[PDB]
């Protein structure tokens with residue numbers, strides 16, 4: 001028992017981290033097979049960042065200008081190309097530590113682990129969710145660009161995020177491994193609005209099921225609700241509308257605990273309307289939304 | 305910016321995890337050099353657990369009864385011995401993935417990462433603190449015994465915890481890598497009181513400094529306090545008494561922010577006496593105590 005914000009073991013990803021330097025800029029790269037992936041803003045100087053013409057900036061660069069180092073050894077760059085907001089540096093050596101991997105575009109509300117890196121060296125690992133507004137609330141400092149987000153299913157690492165920037169609001173923005181930003185963001189130092197965010201209702205309900213499994217049950221009540229009534233409350237409290245698809249995803253947890261999804265919705269409705277009254281749930285004094293139903297089942301079942 | 309409950313990258317430790325089976329019981333072992341370390345309760349049957357005579361139970365076992373498997377390959381056991389509550393199984397092969405390591409006994413209030421494992425396979429990693437009462441609030445299921453806690457300084461892994469049991473209260477107990485329990489616990493299925501726990505004051509203050517560094521400053525006030533006055537409030541709210549040693553450990557964070565430690569104590573005093581009034585600090589609605597001053601400096605400086 002016990003419930004923690006658990007990240008995937010980072011070993012398979014640590015073996016892929018490299019340092020990429022172009023001119024004066026050093027950031028992280030991800031070495032899979034004979035390709036190193038990194039944010040294209042590595043080719044920018046501070047002056048270029050206000051409105052960079054990435055095509056023109058990349059034309060001034062040659063393979064020998066991209067310094068790629070895997071720990072202590074230098075990699076030889078034999079090709080370079082830009083795909084959306086990422087640079088792909090072809091190297092003459094396949095990474096011997098390349099795990100089985102896939103590139104995936106995660107959906108908002110889904111979670112993943114981040115291996116925060118500086119100078120190609122891993123510093124720490126943490127779990128987070130892709131917010132409904134396509135930002136992440138991470139922990140990144142200058143030099144962390146190119147750090148990646150991922151999930152692991154058995155021996156396969158599905159890479160879903162590469163870190164590009166921190167907006168003035170302190171939130172983080174990045175791309176999939178094909179260089180497409182999540183959300184409306186651009187890799188340019190210009191004002192950028194992140195959309196209105198919402199709380200991930202299905203994840204809060206999953207976390208309430210995790211609380212029941214782990215013995216925190218004080219919030220269970222004698223009430224029930226309907227999807228329509230619950231959604232009126234979700235609207236008022238800026239929660240994502242619950243759909244039948246969400247109810248079905250919560251099916252396994254409902255079966256495990258014997259608590260109907262709509263009965264758990266009535267508990268969540270009362271918590272939204274009354275607050276916690278100074279009490280806690282799984283060590284938290286707020287409603288947690290960065291655990292998916294799959295995360296709860298995985299952590300509560302011991303999937304390796 | 306941003307502040308997360310960050311764990312160390314687990315790769316160096318993943319390379320040390322093995323499965324240990326004795327009779328009917330399977331748990332995790334830690335393979336360093338030519339020794340595999342694991343909880344001695346692996347030699348128990350369910351009936352033995354009420355009052356096991358570990359010396360007598362171990363006498364009925366031979367080297368060939370300890371089945372040690374590192375992933376897919378079987379290890380050959382050439383010696384066995386019990387040291388306190390751990391078994392040390394000498395194997396004929398040194399682990400080629402043995403990182404630079406040390407065995408350390410951590411102090412209460414200190415933090416470490418846990419690589420939760422099942423059947424010798426890593427499942428996830430999370431950060432936690434050794435509570436003042438020598439328990440940990442982890443996330444462990446049956447089969448997680450032998451999972452380890454650790455810290456990493458550069459290329460050296462300091463192992464500090466090995467998981468042994470979950471008490472009826474849902475808290476976790478374990479040993480250092482010499483098999484000595486943290487706290488008053490015994491590896492026996494018998495009633496065991498964990499002492500009165502307290503909140504780790506120096507860690508809460510460190511986390512308030514982390515909040516200021518990351519822009520959450522609403523709790524800063526026009527007040528100051530003394531160590532004596534603060535400690536009267538700490539007593540009332542079951543917080544550890546703050547000492548001059550704690551003030552000195554907070555020195556680097558005080559210098560970085562320009563906020564005197566006793567001024568931060570007055571902010572903490574007001575938060576203890578008034579609560580948060582429905583507000584949050586670094587995404588939390590409660591006062592967080594599982595970040596040490598060193599953790600805050602490390603995360604805020606990007607140490608790899």
Ligand SMILES: Cc1ccncc1NC(=O)Cc1cc(Cl)cc(-c2ccc(C)c(F)c2F)c1
Pocket residue numbers: 041049140141142143144145164165166167168186187188189190191192305
């Ligand atoms: C410092 C740091 C901390 C954590 N994570 C990453 C970083 N580095 C960056 O954000 C670098 C970067 C790159 C790009 Cl392409 C755009 C911007 C940027 C975007 C919008 C605004 C308005 C602005 F001021 C900006 F500087 C900034």
Ligand SMILES: Cc1ccncc1NC(=O)Cc1cc(Cl)cc(-c2ccc(C)c(F)c2F)c1
Pocket residue numbers: 001345353444445446447448449468469470471472490491492493494495496
């Ligand atoms: C199931 C689980 C979940 C998370 N982590 C670990 C485990 N496994 C265990 O705790 C196994 C174990 C071993 C030892 Cl030596 C003593 C006890 C034990 C101690 C005290 C009591 C009263 C009691 F009921 C007990 F079973 C229990």
